[model samples]
Target: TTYTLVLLRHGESTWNKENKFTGWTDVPLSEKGEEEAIAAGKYLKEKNFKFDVVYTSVLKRAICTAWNVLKTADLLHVPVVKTWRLNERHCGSLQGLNKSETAKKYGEEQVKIWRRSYDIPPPKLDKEDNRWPGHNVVYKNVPKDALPFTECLKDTVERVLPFWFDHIAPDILANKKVMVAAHGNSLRGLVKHLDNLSEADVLELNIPTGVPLVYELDENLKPIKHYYLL
Candidate 1:
């Protein structure tokens, strides 16, 4: 028997239409985002895939995508687990700002430096800032230190891997088919670890939304092969 795992990113949110940073800010899927989830579900159906458990972030986009995918795949009965650790990379002060507009203000290279470079995180969100994750009640159970004021992809991977080992990995090791629906950066962080990508290599890694990336693994959970179901 082999281990099967799938990763999915939520499709276009209204923020992308607005061309803004959505990191840790809960956003819903755009119109076609729903359609994209359906298409991903069809891909699962074509492969006769059924998940024993699905994981997602607490944000609506990922949660909503989870429902849509399971619905179309006829696997709505599968259990879903949500975690803030699986949430998108926290963009800190950059949250809700427009893409080009921020680039215009900060200059392209500096801003891209924060986005693309590993280890160097963006500016921290001030406690007084309304967008600060600390103000949110949903994360009350999450330890204060555990909640991020700002995050780089490295920070994202730091948080995600603990949950992977504690929860998702065990399920997979038990031979359960697992699906994770999360944001792009979070999935990027996750795949970086799964594929053992280099720091420089992860800079170019971009996860496409609404596509199910499947991984087949050996008993040790080392990936034998991985590909998009589409």
Candidate 2:
């Protein structure tokens, strides 16, 4: 049986336009981001795409994007699941810092290393820091220790894979169409696994906002072909 999976990155955020680190900050979409979501939705509608189920991060940006996509595609009747596991990688102490300003403060080379390194995490946010998401009501049920102050791509992958294997894979194996609406880093984690990309290759990869990447999979759930809808 042929199975299809669609991976979509959330539309841009206010912080995205400001070029600031926004990991787990729960920022909403910008005006352009809203338009992007609507456009992506229309594109999916024109393609006559319909999903059996939908998954998205707890973050509002991702949730809203998924909502818009399904609404436009006329597939809002499908089940939609939201999980913290699908959230963006936590940027720790860098959560709200402007990228260029951070680079100016820390050498550009150091900033590059932090952003591009596969396993090296940015500076950790103190547990007591107000910036920490641990105290957030939405994450109140998550174990305190489970919340991250910072994360590298490797760290993100480690957390994301389990959810894929446990929740997402079974639906695809059952020949159901599945759609995942998430953040850049989380989507990268999925792409790295699906495409078997190396650390270096993943570092160079960037997921544009509001893009729908469709994957056609075999019985074993390996991707046979994948392409962007636009």
Candidate 3:
């Protein structure tokens, strides 16, 4: 049987506009991002797409984008599952820093390795650092040790896959329509599994914000094909 899934990257955030490493900073969407989300929702509406369940990160940018999209598509009653596992990779000490300036400060190659290499995480954040995820009240239920100080894409992918195994796969196997609205790195975790992509392939994966990425899946929940839902 063919199953359909929709994946969305959260629209541009305030930090996105400022060119900062947002990570799990909990920033809201930019105005352009809001419009992008609405447009995506309206497109789904036009196509008569309906979702059985929606999933997203706990952070504001991801949640707000999903919220606006559902509202615009008239799918407000759909169940939403929010989890910290869906969050953007922790940017470590780079959180809130300007991307360009970071490159200038740490040499371009080192910064590229930090940002693009799959397993090489940037500098780790200290537990007592204000940027620590443990400081957030929303993540209080999460085991302190499970929380990340900083994460490479590999780190993010490992955590994200378990959620997919436990939550998303079952829904898709049952033929339930699923929409996942999340950060770029988080969504990549899901994509990596669906496509069985290599580390280099995932490194080049760049999903645009607010665009619906529709996947046609086979019985095993592997991608038959995928395309931007333009």
Off by over 4 Å in 2: none
Model 2 per-residue lDDT tens digits across residues 52-141? 999999999999998888888777789999999999998879888888888888888988888889999999989789988787889898
Per-candidate local distance difference test: 0.89, 0.89, 0.90
Q: lDDT of candidate 3 vs native?
A: 0.90
Displacement of the residue 89 alpha carbon in candidate 2, Å: 1.3
Number of the top-ranking candidate, with lDDT as the measure: 3
Candidate 2 accuracy as TM-score: 0.96
Which window of ten consecutive residues has the lowest lDDT sum in model 1? 140-149
Model 3, 123-166: lDDT tens per residue? 88898798898988999999989999889999999999999999
Per-residue lDDT value at 217 in model 2: 85
In the predicted model 3, the residue pairs found to clash are none
lDDT for predicted candidate 1 compared with the true structure: 0.89
Give me candidate 1's TM-score against the actual structure: 0.97
Query: How many collisions per candidate?
Result: 0, 0, 0
Flag regions of model 3 displaced more than 4 Å.
Answer: none
